[PDB]
């Protein structure tokens, strides 16, 4: 799963 | 910190251009992180996104053979390289960018300035790349 | 990749950490980790033990300590989703989602409540999509 938006 | 991808897409893309569609997806697997749609012939699918991701990373020129398929629609390619693919269907414009880890795509409603779409998508791509995304 | 940048540029910007790690819950595989002057590297074995314990018998952390980076944290709170510990002036927060284990510990004197908020909010981000 991707990390949150920067 | 810990904001949703859906909020990000709705804000960073969809509040800045009048979109028919906008999607952030994983570059490896075409997994949708978030997407917004208006009234597309079909929902954007993982398969569509995987095909794009694989093509932009391996052989961007491949988009000249069959076009760009998203939301059940075919866009004719006007630009293709490893970082940026652009196309058109009628007066709707599509802009796709690849960063380190994601694919960003948005298409505008008929008649909306393509240059604005491209600037928004490409600027957001650049920002993401600069943050190692 | 993106996870390491997230830790460095986000979590570690908002928490003054002695360590941070993002790992797979099932195997303890490290997605990203940061370490500041730990006695030893954080290991997959350490992470697997924590993953097993938070899932199966969180009371086990009272029995066996909390071991990360060759340091021992003493448990002050334990349930299936959330484990907290302390070592001196350092605080540890661990969160388990469906598929991820999150851990960070502070440098001496950094507000534990900020630690806990940041770690827990990231757990929430993941649980929102069933991760």
From TrEMBL, chain C:
Q: Sorted alphabetically, which SMART domains does this protein's record hold?
A: PROF (SM00392)
Name the InterPro entries on file: PFN, PFN_euk, PFN_sf, Profilin_CS
The record, for SUPFAM superfamilies, names: Profilin (actin-binding protein)
Protein's UniProt keywords contain DNA damage = no
What is known about what this protein does?
Answer: Binds to actin and affects the structure of the cytoskeleton. At high concentrations, profilin prevents the polymerization of actin, whereas it enhances it at low concentrations.
| Similarity comment text for this entry | Belongs to the profilin family.
Q: Please describe the quaternary structure of this protein.
A: Occurs in many kinds of cells as a complex with monomeric actin in a 1:1 ratio.
| Protein known as | Profilin
Q: Which organism is it from?
A: Tyrophagus putrescentiae (Mold mite)
